Amino acid sequence: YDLKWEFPRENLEFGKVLGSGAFGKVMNATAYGISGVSIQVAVKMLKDSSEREALMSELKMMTQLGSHENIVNLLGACTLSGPIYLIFEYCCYGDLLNYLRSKRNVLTFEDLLCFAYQVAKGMEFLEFKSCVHRDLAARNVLVTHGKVVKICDFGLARDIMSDSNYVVRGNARLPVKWMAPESLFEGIYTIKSDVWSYGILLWEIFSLGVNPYPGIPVDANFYKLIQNGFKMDQPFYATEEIYIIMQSCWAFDSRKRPSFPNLTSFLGCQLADA
Amino acid sequence: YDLKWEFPRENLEFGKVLGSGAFGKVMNATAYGISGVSIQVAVKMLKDSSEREALMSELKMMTQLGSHENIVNLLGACTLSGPIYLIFEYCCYGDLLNYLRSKRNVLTFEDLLCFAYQVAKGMEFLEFKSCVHRDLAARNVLVTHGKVVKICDFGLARDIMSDSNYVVRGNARLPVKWMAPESLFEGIYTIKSDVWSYGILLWEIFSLGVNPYPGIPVDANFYKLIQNGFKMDQPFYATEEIYIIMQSCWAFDSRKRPSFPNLTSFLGCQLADA
Numbered sequence A, B: 001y002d003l004k005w006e007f008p009r010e011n012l013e014f015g016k017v018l019g020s021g022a023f024g025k026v027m028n029a030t031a032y033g034i035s036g037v038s039i040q041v042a043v044k045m046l047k048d049s050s051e052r053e054a055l056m057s058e059l060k061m062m063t064q065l066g067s068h069e070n071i072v073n074l075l076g077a078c079t080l081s082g083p084i085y086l087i088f089e090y091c092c093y094g095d096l097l098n099y100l101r102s103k104r105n106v107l108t109f110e111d112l113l114c115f116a117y118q119v120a121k122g123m124e125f126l127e128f129k130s131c132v133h134r135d136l137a138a139r140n141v142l143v144t145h146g147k148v149v150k151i152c153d154f155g156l157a158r159d160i161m162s163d164s165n166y167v168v169r170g171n172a173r174l175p176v177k178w179m180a181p182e183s184l185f186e187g188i189y190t191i192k193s194d195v196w197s198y199g200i201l202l203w204e205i206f207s208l209g210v211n212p213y214p215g216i217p218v219d220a221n222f223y224k225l226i227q228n229g230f231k232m233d234q235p236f237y238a239t240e241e242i243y244i245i246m247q248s249c250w251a252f253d254s255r256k257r258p259s260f261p262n263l264t265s266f267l268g269c270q271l272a273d274a
């Protein structure tokens, strides 16, 4: 743990709560001298030592990572004289899933294309840094000024007990509709697992925030539907090209899916034309 | 049949034979006053009235079609005082399949990308004109000056009795490895059937002319292999992007394949980058 991250907690001026869960929360705050004179920041904190580490493990993970434009970037932390705080960039428009739903500032197709592009840029970065995201969805992407989007993970700051998209499977509560077959049936999580999730995230964007596999519940039939190769139909705001791209992320063989460098090229092409 | 097509057969100066079959042939010739003062042309002709029409039906089909750059274009015809001739543009480098094989003028990846692009341009044209090609392969594409490629059909000017890629199935001899499942199992031939063939043609280009499904013979197992969703692995000269594109042409559902306008956009993007 580098010392340059350590930020005076007294310089933090707390505002409203941005998200809450059973383990922890994300507050909004004003931080003096971390950038102007002060900026808006988002602060992660807890509310049990089995999770005092899971935060600390997130702390060292975010510092090793390095910054990217399409990632919620760490600015500082408080880890010495009191409770642990992780200080992030503030994304004033909240998560992408709600942002899309509320937009049903006017929203164009090219914006949709941009959102998709930036997320693939951000996952390309993670691929390079050799990370996997175990919960990649639209709800785990934030929106800031200038239609910029940043990938994040609420993790302990989301109440999964009351989120219907997290389904009890085995000794856990998982976001099943976003998960790859190897994840579901072998507990495997790779960058290509993320690619499958990205495909679902594309569906989320170009449906404008419709729940994946709409009208289909998560029961015994769903797992056999996925396992027999079921794929969603085209979402309303998808072009023909995008749907094909979206479909490649859903190859049952994880080896047959595109990489994120591939996805960035495919979507870069679409942006240049659109 | 418009009269502007009618060309004086005396103005034709015949050279070598460019292709032969059981029904007819394609001669090379010099035609005076059909364009310079004279040009090289390719002439289709027969060698039985059940095929005197199949040629005449090709004649009226090529005149209704209109010209495109990536199509072997009709220039004139002789249909009044003697045997029927159809006068086409001359493509001096022969068919694309041999051209690739002999190149194993130096050949670059971007040329490969261009070949693929032009063929999709040409099939996009046919799609618009509401035609299907029932035999789309690399062997049915010609190469001219400037690395330009033009789609064609030898048809009666190819000896299928001695071409191992035409397999006896039912009461016919068909190019099985290039054929879509609906074609094979329902006798259906649509523009999306052509899309599947285009996928195989891509494989041909980026393998540099390797026979599709190499090491796999056309027997009972092959039809059940295709029917159970078997797809070729990546050809040696394919990039990651191209393979994904190539794979979309092979969706078992014909409705899930890209259109040719789609393919042109996908490959146009790749050209712009490469």
Ligand SMILES: CC(C)(C)c1cc(NC(=O)Nc2ccc(-c3cn4c(n3)sc3cc(OCCN5CCOCC5)ccc34)cc2)no1
Residues within 6 Å of the ligand: A018, A019, A026, A042, A043, A044, A058, A062, A065, A071, A072, A088, A089, A090, A091, A092, A093, A094, A095, A131, A132, A133, A142, A151, A152, A153, A154, A157
């Ligand atoms: C990606 C990677 C590296 C794997 C990772 C990240 C990670 N860790 C994290 O991503 N941590 C983290 C950091 C910040 C946030 C976060 C949430 N919000 C903001 N930052 S800014 C914000 C603003 C919000 O609402 C504003 C008002 N809106 C408009 C009006 O209506 C209400 C909504 C709501 C939530 C919200 C979440 C998680 N650990 O690993």
Ligand SMILES: CC(C)(C)c1cc(NC(=O)Nc2ccc(-c3cn4c(n3)sc3cc(OCCN5CCOCC5)ccc34)cc2)no1
Residues within 6 Å of the ligand: B018, B019, B026, B042, B043, B044, B058, B062, B065, B071, B072, B088, B089, B090, B091, B092, B093, B094, B095, B131, B132, B133, B142, B151, B152, B153, B154, B157
């Ligand atoms: C597409 C559509 C509309 C469905 C269609 C087309 C259609 N009908 C047709 O496409 N007809 C047609 C017209 C021309 C040719 C043809 C063949 N060749 C040429 N034109 S120019 C040429 C030159 C060749 O060799 C030159 C020397 N090479 C280099 C040295 O080694 C030897 C080889 C060989 C073949 C050849 C084929 C078919 N009917 O419908």
